[PDB]
Structure 1
Amino acid sequence: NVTGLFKDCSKVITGLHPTQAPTHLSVDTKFKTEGLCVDIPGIPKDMTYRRLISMMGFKMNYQVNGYPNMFITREEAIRHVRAWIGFDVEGCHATREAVGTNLPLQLGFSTGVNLVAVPTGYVDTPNNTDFSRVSAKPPPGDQFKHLIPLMYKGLPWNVVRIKIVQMLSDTLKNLSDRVVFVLWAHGFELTSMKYFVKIGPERTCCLCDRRATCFSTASDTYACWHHSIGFDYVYNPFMIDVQQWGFTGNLQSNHDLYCQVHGNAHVASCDAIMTRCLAVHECFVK
């Protein structure tokens, strides 16, 4: 059966050649027979194309020795409360040369900050995958009127991930040796993390013996929250999903069960605050 991860979001009816397709499912039907594929010299391989590949549907259930889990139990989250950062992402929609996947528009945090990124995605070409800006539009509903202006307001992803690393470092430097991203219905937040998170075995900061907590692509090096200066990638974060603790309604509905001081000007940071707020109430009351 199928999965939505890496869904081909092009509008082309056809594609792909046996040599250019990443997977058997994405071969054009002309080349399929007897459950296999066949080379047909007279059909040229497409040496121009740009196919948007969906990053929705990631699953982080790997179990490899040396590599730590991103998703952690509530108790592990309890022990690292000071590392908690609520995180929400409002998104936009692929719309011109593609349709059927969502792209990060505005990322928000428990720290009141909100950042907004240019709509960019992962586009397959005849030679490689091209990380690039792509056409997009706001979610249709009248409830999403406030992201109309955000479409114009920023910001290249190489800049966005510089600012994310700097904001968490300046927040977490004197509080913990890690992040715990506090999510609510985590799928799209996990998709955004592809844009600014690397993972591997545990590492130590060059310049330190402290746990490595950021990564730099300028040179393949690692750092702690204090020495992550100019770094662009968050390395081996941790995260929890409040919704997986049993909650019927939506985020605001379930938060307002405990707390009545967090109103909601519908900003991404406002959701991330209610996400962290509701996790504290659930975890430590009674």
Structure 2
Amino acid sequence: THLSVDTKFKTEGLCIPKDMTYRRLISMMGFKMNYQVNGYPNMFITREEAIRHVRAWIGFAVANLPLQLGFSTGVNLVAVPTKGLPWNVVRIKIVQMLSDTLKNLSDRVVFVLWAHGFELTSMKYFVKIGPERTCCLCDRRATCFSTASDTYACWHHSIGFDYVYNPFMIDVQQWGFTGNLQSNHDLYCQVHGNAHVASCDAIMTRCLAVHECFVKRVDWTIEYPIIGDELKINAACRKVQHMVVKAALLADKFPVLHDIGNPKAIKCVPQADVEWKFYDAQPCSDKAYKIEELFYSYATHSDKFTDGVCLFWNCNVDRYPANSIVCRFDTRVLSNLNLPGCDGGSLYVNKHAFHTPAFDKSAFVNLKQLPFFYYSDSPCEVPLKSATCITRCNLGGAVCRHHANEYRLYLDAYNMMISAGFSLWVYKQFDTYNLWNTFT
């Protein structure tokens, strides 16, 4: 489960032996590893584990000489060992930075590294380590230490603290790359250029870790803790998914529905009375028999899916065809669930980690925004006067207390979802006109 200290460390990347282990590395950074039996058996963590703690990822790079310390936050700090700053002021601003960045993301920090060596040596200057401690002021894990008061604090209660306590890290060069950082990074990303500074290294180093671990495909096995409104959000998206698809079907009576990017083969309108077809790039083994393996791009499938309507519910493709229903996460929304990722994309960590290409308007060229409405054919068990309440009773005169209340709940569900950063799009020929007809 944990990364053994006895695992060999490839030194090839370090400007001083060859046949080295983590134990011998850590000792050389200036740290005593006796805390194996206290929940901190290694400063470095397994890739497996790093992925579980992606919310904690902070890229770190370093350019007696002065030292420039860079981070994925685009912050650079210069330390005069004794432009530059005293080490006491630097190490305070580090803890300040990390706390600010991570207080609402993780219970720890993972330093993501392209190990040139000079940064691993620097760690002893701003990192203390020991047994796993809880915070003095709350029951949160301790991430910081104050030499002044000899107390330990989480990211929330770290104000004025100077040393980072029990940080985790990974050297990416230990994943069998060749060539320098920028060579490997620039393959997958052209949003992060070099300015020949540490922060740019830190940024790229994280950007590339994110690519290797997330861009590839969704790992449905790994799940992430609730840090926000996940449950409210995910519930509301499903309530909408149902309402929207049901309505599109009733309106235009599509013979078939191409549910693209459905790896679980589950109908969101179970009692449909429509040919329901499931597709996905990575169908789940358990249900793979009902799901066609397919990676949609317009270039490859503009001459397919001619019949009926395509459902792309958070299936984020180059360009959607004209006969589409789409829910798409606007990667530009600022959120604790929305982490920056590869090539202007972003890593949306909700229940699972979902890497998304950057939100581009050009994808929706063949579509229009899906306007808000509420539709119900169900029975009718502060009087609401809405043109967008498409029920029997609304055109009738006043609307029943049942539908009236369902509207106010669906509306909150819509507003919850839009606020969460999702956007709704539909075939340009869509209109509620036909849903009014379903009554007369």
User: Same fold by TM-score, threshold 0.5 exceeded?
Assistant: yes
Q: What does 1:28-177 correspond to in 2, within 5 Å? A: 57-58=28-29, 62=33, 64-68=36-40, 69-90=42-63, 94=64, 103=65, 105-118=67-80, 120=81, 133=82, 153-177=83-107
1:194 match: secondary structure:
helix
| Distance change in 2, residues 1:265/1:157 (3 Å) | same
Q: What does 1:256-267 correspond to in 2, within 5 Å? A: 256-267=186-197
Aligned to 2:410: none
Q: What does 1:238-253 correspond to in 2, within 5 Å? A: 238-253=168-183
1:229 match: secondary structure:
coil
Indicate yes or no: 2:186 matched with 1:213: no
Instruction: Report the CA distance between 1:57 and its aligned residue.
Output: 4.0
2:200 match: secondary structure:
helix
TM-score, normalised to structure 2, is: 0.42
Distance in 2, Cα, partners of 1:238 & 1:260: 28
| Distance change in 2, residues 1:60/1:117 (3 Å) | closer
Distance in 2, Cα, partners of 1:61 & 1:72: 17
User: Which protein is bigger by CA-based radius of gyration?
Assistant: 2
Q: Unaligned stretches of 5+ in structure 1?
A: 6-54, 95-102, 121-132, 134-152
1:107 match: secondary structure:
strand
1:166 match: secondary structure:
helix
Instruction: Report the CA distance between 1:284 and its aligned residue.
Output: 1.7
Which structure features the higher share of helix residues? 2
| Distance change in 2, residues 1:209/1:164 (3 Å) | same
TM-score, normalised to structure 1, is: 0.63
Distance in 2, Cα, partners of 1:159 & 1:79: 32
Paired residues, number = 191
Aligned to 2:208: 278
Higher relative contact order (CA 8 A, sep 6+): 1
Q: Any conservation in 2 of the 1:89–1:104 contact (CA below 8 Å)?
A: no
% identical equivalent positions = 89
Distance in 1, Cα, partners of 2:168 & 2:121: 14
Q: What letter matches 1:58 in structure 2?
A: M
CA RMSD of aligned residues (A): 2.1
Aligned to 2:372: none
Distance in 2, Cα, partners of 1:241 & 1:200: 21
| Distance change in 2, residues 1:62/1:56 (3 Å) | closer
Instruction: Report the CA distance between 1:67 and its aligned residue.
Output: 4.9
Q: Any conservation in 1 of the 2:27–2:33 contact (CA below 8 Å)?
A: no
| Runs of 4 or more above 2 Å deviation | 55-64
Q: What letter matches 1:237 in structure 2?
A: P
Indicate yes or no: 2:150 matched with 1:229: no
Q: Unaligned stretches of 5+ in structure 2?
A: 1-15, 18-25, 217-440
Instruction: Report the CA distance between 1:270 and its aligned residue.
Output: 0.5
2:48 match: secondary structure:
helix
